[PDB]
Design a protein around this ligand. Sequence first.
Ligand SMILES: */C=C\C(=O)N1CCC[C@@H](n2nc(-c3ccc(Oc4ccccc4)cc3)c3c(N)ncnc32)C1
Length: 302
Amino acid sequence: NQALLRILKETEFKKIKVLGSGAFGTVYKGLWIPEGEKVKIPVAIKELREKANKEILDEAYVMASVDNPHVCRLLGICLTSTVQLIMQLMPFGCLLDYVREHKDNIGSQYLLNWCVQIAKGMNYLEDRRLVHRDLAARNVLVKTPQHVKITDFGLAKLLKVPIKWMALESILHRIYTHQSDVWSYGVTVWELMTFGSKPYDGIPASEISSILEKGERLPQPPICTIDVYMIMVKCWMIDADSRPKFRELIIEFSKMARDPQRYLVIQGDERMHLPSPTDSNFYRALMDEEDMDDVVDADEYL
Ligand SMILES: */C=C\C(=O)N1CCC[C@@H](n2nc(-c3ccc(Oc4ccccc4)cc3)c3c(N)ncnc32)C1
């Protein structure tokens, strides 16, 4: 579906501010102004650091074809000897920055729900027989605090390797599968549960395969019950086929979401809440009108 990707002229948009800079590229806050109109519409622009345009376009069409509440869809592209990718601007930013900023005051309901949502997005990709190759907290965007979407799908294929998120088989032989995606998902969950901690920090990348072969793993976060830690451990099993499936993960986390205090131990959690319906309705109307499955709420509390 070529209609899904908009080809943008340089004249119809402008980069206004740098939001972040990456090995993959630089991300800018931008404005689209549509031809013949007086409106300036905020957009996010990713300019890749630096394959012919035909190959790039062909990859781009697939990237534009992902349509799920929990995956970000590439909206537009401009090809000018630099590759510029256009998507919605998300004021909330990446999940990783968000958890660090809120590290004191994030509730168990949010964390479990984020786990469900990410799994839902990954599952959609698996169902489509597509592999992300770079799942990480940095690569999840926050639409609203209640709603998160996986981003940068297909970028890894298109283009400093994230060794510390990679499955052993990926590090060793660069084999990427839904099962390697599951491994990355586990690291991502660990990031959330540690409020933005950097996995294997201080361990050189060159040693990572060896420690994994030894069987060393990321440690259990203090907030996590063993039940949650075991799910991460299952994600990092050497035999890829043994690892959990995204469809299973959606169910497990959803179950946990029903009695959060059973599975995550957080100080003052009783004080921290998912939004009331009134608040949720307000957020959706203002900035999140797309259809999504309702957040899983505690059985006790509704
Ligand atoms: C934790 C991530 C981080 O540090 N960032 C730096 C600041 C910007 C932030 N960010 N990135 C995007 C973003 C992501 C992807 C794309 O383009 C795509 C889309 C789909 C597939 C491949 C490439 C563009 C922009 C942000 C957006 N969209 N809004 C707000 N912050 C974004 C990452």
